[PDB]
Amino acid sequence: QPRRVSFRSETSPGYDPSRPESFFQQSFQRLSRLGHGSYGEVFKVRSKEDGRLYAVKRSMSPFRGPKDRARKLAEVGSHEKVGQHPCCVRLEQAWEEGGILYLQTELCGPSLQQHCEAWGASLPEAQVWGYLRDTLLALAHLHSQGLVHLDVKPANIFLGPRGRCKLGDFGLLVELGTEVQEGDPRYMAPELLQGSYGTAADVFSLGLTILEVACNMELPHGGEGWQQLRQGYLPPEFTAGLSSELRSVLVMMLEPDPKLRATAEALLALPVLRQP
Numbered sequence: 560q561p562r563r564v565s566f567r568s569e570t571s572p573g574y575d576p577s578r579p580e581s582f583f584q585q586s587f588q589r590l591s592r593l594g595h596g597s598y599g600e601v602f603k604v605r606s607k608e609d610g611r612l613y614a615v616k617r618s619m620s621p622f623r624g625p626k627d628r629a630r631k632l633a634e635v636g637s638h639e640k641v642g643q644h645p646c647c648v649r650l651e652q653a654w655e656e657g658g659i660l661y662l663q664t665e666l667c668g669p670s671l672q673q674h675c676e677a678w679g680a681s682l683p684e685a686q687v688w689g690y691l692r693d694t695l696l697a698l699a700h701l702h703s704q705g706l707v708h709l710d711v712k713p714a715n716i717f718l719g720p721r722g723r724c725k726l727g728d729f730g731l732l733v734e735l736g737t738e739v740q741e742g743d744p745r746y747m748a749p750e751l752l753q754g755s756y757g758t759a760a761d762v763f764s765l766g767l768t769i770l771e772v773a774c775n776m777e778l779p780h781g782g783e784g785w786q787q788l789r790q791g792y793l794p795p796e797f798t799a800g801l802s803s804e805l806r807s808v809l810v811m812m813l814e815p816d817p818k819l820r821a822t823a824e825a826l827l828a829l830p831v832l833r834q835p
């Protein structure tokens with residue numbers, strides 16, 4: 560039986576409990592599969608209730624134990640803490656059935672990773688600035704409530720109409736308070752190695768995210784190149800095309816010291832990052 564999942568109607572017309580098919584198969588029409596992996600499968604679906612378009616992600620295998628169930632269900636809780644924000648993916652409803660967790664969110668466009676692969680070059684700075692502003696707005700929303708995304712990267716930023724984008728994938732989100740999972744080392748803030756976790760980590764990740772898409776550069780997983788991006792100076796070989804304004808903003812975001820690194824509110828207050 561399907562049960563609703565929320566951390567705040569735990570018990571549908573298109574779904575008959577007498578029928579043996581699952582709630583997902585009975586109340587949704589799978590138009591296409593947006594992605595699949597160890598996390599499970601993501602489908603572009605049309606709801607048989609209101610007809611609007613949504614995206615539903617389901618886990619791959621049933622819950623192994625209580626720890627696995629609580630680990631997967633924690634994403635729903637983190638998504639609720641974010642709340643409704645124009646630059647954050649909105650969660651409609653979440654439910655479990657047969658040890659499988661389903662998350663239904665609004666349908667967004669392609670991820671920033673897919674867009675940059677298709678463009679096959681450095682993104683135009685006009686597109687970069689808008690994506691930097693929208694993600695900073697999302698980060699400022701999370702940071703104001705004491706939340707750290709910890710996985711800001713092109714794959715977790717989804718494009719929208721008119722050059723807008725939304726932040727997604729809150730599985731690694733933690734609430735700073737008086738349980739951290741491993742993140743992508745290519746976008747890892749330098750202080751995370753020493754266990755210093757704070758909202759400043761997201762700003763550094765977005766800095767490397769923008770640096771990657773604005774220069775079409777592959778971020779290193781480790782080594783000397785990993786250090787060079789974290790010593791306070793930018794690599795001149797790929798940052799030549801960057802404008803003086805964008806380069807200065809990246810230097811602010813890539814400050815190795817968390818105490819000195821600028822905040823999302825401070826960056827958004829700058830005139831270059833104000834909505835034109």
Ligand SMILES: Cc1ccc(O)c(C)c1-n1c(N)c(C(N)=O)c2nc3cc(Br)ccc3nc21
Pocket residue numbers: 593594595601614615616648662663664665666667668669717727728729
């Ligand atoms: C389904 C879902 C649940 C929770 C959550 O936080 C997010 C961001 C989503 N979610 C979307 N709302 C996507 C979209 N296009 O609207 C979307 N596309 C994906 C593509 C790949 Br490949 C892998 C995972 C994806 N997860 C997605």
